[PDB]
Design an enzyme around this catalytic site. Structure first.
Site, PDB file in Angstrom:
ATOM      1  CG  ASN A 196      24.002  93.420  -7.837  1.00 17.33           C
ATOM      2  OD1 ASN A 196      23.477  93.124  -6.761  1.00 17.33           O
ATOM      3  ND2 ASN A 196      24.184  94.678  -8.222  1.00 17.33           N
TER       4      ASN A 196
ATOM      5  CG  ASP B 244      19.743  99.562  -2.174  1.00 16.21           C
ATOM      6  OD1 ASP B 244      19.680 100.003  -3.337  1.00 16.21           O
ATOM      7  OD2 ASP B 244      20.093  98.395  -1.901  1.00 16.21           O
TER       8      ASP B 244
ATOM      9  CG  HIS C 135      21.419  95.637  -4.076  1.00 11.55           C
ATOM     10  ND1 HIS C 135      21.255  96.970  -3.765  1.00 11.55           N
ATOM     11  CD2 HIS C 135      22.127  95.607  -5.230  1.00 11.55           C
ATOM     12  CE1 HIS C 135      21.832  97.714  -4.692  1.00 11.55           C
ATOM     13  NE2 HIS C 135      22.368  96.911  -5.594  1.00 11.55           N
TER      14      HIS C 135
END
Ligand code: NDP
Ligand code: NDP
Lengths: 327, 327
Positions: free
Chosen positions: B131, B159, B187
């Site tokens: 991330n 997800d 995300h």
């Protein structure tokens, strides 16, 4: 088309369980055509963490995971179980001697062994991973009257795979070409990795490596491998241990390759003169959910001595637990 | 046996890596008949641990693992790579900053994007997990001119799977019977799980659940799922994230099921009016290393509102990266 089978796994919130459960749910242990019901056993202390594990399993959306239940009760986790992987064992508390651990494990496996006999399928396949594996397995089956002792096994498959890996490395060949590896005895420092019958692409292993390497390098390295992982990662070999447990159950249930065999610590019935009762690792073949010790192998002095040494260590371990009245 | 393919994985000594590598080596990502060569990238700091992971991988005796190499050099890790899973990202030193975080990740992904463009296979398939995934992917492909930008993707599959899990739980049906789930956008907390096209056993989802549950329970729960695992386990969702990564690559390389689709964050080309250039999660079908956004779907107000919000968040992130001169 196939009905689901119930797989009980203890120590579910631990490291090995974290590297084990997902691959089982993915179908890697009993087949991509076999739905599984995971019955996870944890302790009151790690139950919150176990709920976390349950959530991650759900978040994988596994098509074969037909059931998922977490509990702290052995009689619930082992209920109608077709398979039981006993990964959980006594923790290593500070100021806790060998004997102290011995009695803690004694209680765990006496209880779980009894639970299995009371609520699991009568032909439940049991694999003990929690250490000391061989002796914990002995405690379990001795306390599981009414159940087939041979359905109680201990894991030496990691030692087995480690041996294959080392042999492949040394010979510069694919590990997929290594056959007939054997690790005899106790899952401990006295384990005996046997190269006298192993083959590399069909050729006797000892024709590719010498006795000096075998004795002074191969054996000690396989025996110390677990420590090597810890020294490198700063954590135990959970992923490879999980893989070994999967293969141990898989080969047992689905069968071993033609012309090959694997290592499994099982209740001795006198094969190769090994004392009866103790859970000893032998070379074995499997078919239809049942295994058979590979007998008829020539055992030279080198092998015999190491086989006897590990057998004696197991007898001693049995002696200890028996004196504690555990069996 | 297919010719071996080279799979590069960064942050290989981390948690997701520990849950990812073994299943890849087992053939779960590209098929049981597809040999793989694992090229692991680890920083100088985690190299010792990476060597330990290498040993565990060897100790699984995986027949499909045709190669295994650890390095701290991206140009070595990505050399002739057919696939690249960019899991390693930047931490968050005590007291940092957003624009500061983008700086560290900016350097990481600019370097890895360049490395991929220089030494990887021209058609290397890239998935960004570290991330911020969508933005890291943007930085990566922008710095990899010459390489197909559409080959750069970010992961929203976790997800996606979490969403399918929640719907299955609510309706009391098998997760395997859940189809056409979609998670649009970034995300992040603005992710949009779409139930308007999802079907449960062939029946539209909104026929089994109402809008109240959808908005007040479903969406918040899917968004908070990552935190829930941490609060229960005391550790991040490494196993389920690794599973999502495997499925993302798998369904991309092999193919999505007939009549179904998956979520993948890919460089937008204007689909559904989403600004071009930003890596945005879309419903997509895929086959043989190529995917296509499922366009033509009816988008109601409830969906577009949330689709626009997350799109705006991604635009702002892109504007930030641009202002910093990363792209
Ligand atoms: N036989 C073999 O080849 C091997 C055996 N082991 C044995 O497995 C056990 C450690 O397993 P691991 O998962 O790393 O451990 P953990 O310490 O993480 O797990 C111990 C578990 O038992 C309960 N206490 C809890 O289970 P819960 O959360 O579910 O209540 C806890 O998580 C030990 O008994 C170790 O000696 C390890 C590697 C190889
Ligand atoms: N997109 C998704 O669905 C998800 C993304 N993540 C992201 O993955 C990363 C964390 O990965 P994880 O494996 O748990 O991390 P770890 O912190 O355990 O390690 C990841 C690697 O990044 C550096 N820090 C180090 O790499 P080195 O030492 O080599 O420099 C380290 O090995 C974060 O970037 C997180 O935000 C996590 C879960 C789901």
């Amino acid at each position: 088309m196939k009905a689901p089978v119930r797989v009980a796994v203890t120590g579910a919130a631990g490291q090995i369980g974290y590297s084990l459960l997902f691959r089982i749910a993915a179908g890697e242990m009993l087949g991509k055509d076999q739905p599984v019901i995971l019955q996870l056993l944890g302790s009151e202390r790690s139950f919150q963490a176990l709920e976390g594990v349950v959530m991650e399993l759900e978040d994988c959306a596994f098509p074969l995971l037909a059931g998922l239940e977490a509990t702290d009760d052995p009689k619930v986790a082992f209920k109608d179980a077709d398979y039981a992987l006993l990964v959980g064992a006594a923790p290593r508390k500070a100021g806790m001697e060998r004997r102290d651990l011995l009695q803690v494990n004694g209680k765990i496996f006496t209880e779980q062994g009894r639970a299995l006999a009371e609520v699991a399928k009568k032909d439940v396949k049991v694999l003990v991973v929690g250490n000391p594996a061989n002796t914990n397995a002995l405690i379990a089956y001795k306390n599981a009257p009414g159940l087939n002792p041979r359905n109680f096994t201990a894991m030496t498959r990691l030692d087995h795979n480690r041996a294959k890996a080392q042999l492949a490395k040394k010979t510069g060949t694919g590990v997929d070409r290594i056959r007939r590896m054997t690790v005899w005895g106790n899952h401990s420092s006295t384990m005996f990795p046997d190269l006298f019958h192993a083959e590399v692409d069909g050729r006797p292993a000892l024709e590719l490596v010498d006795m000096e390497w075998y004795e002074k390098v191969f054996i000690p390295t396989v025996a110390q491998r677990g420590a090597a992982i810890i020294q490198a990662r700063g954590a135990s070999s959970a992923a490879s241990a999980a893989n070994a447990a999967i293969e141990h159950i898989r080969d047992w249930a689905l069968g071993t390759p033609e012309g090959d065999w694997v290592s499994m610590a099982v209740p001795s019935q006198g094969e190769y003169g090994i004392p009866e009762g103790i859970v000893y690792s032998f070379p074995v073949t499997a078919k239809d959910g049942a295994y058979r010790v590979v007998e008829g192998l020539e055992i030279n002095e080198f092998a015999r001595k190491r086989m006897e040494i590990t057998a004696q260590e197991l007898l001693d371990e049995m002696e200890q637990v028996k004196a504690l009245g555990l069996i």
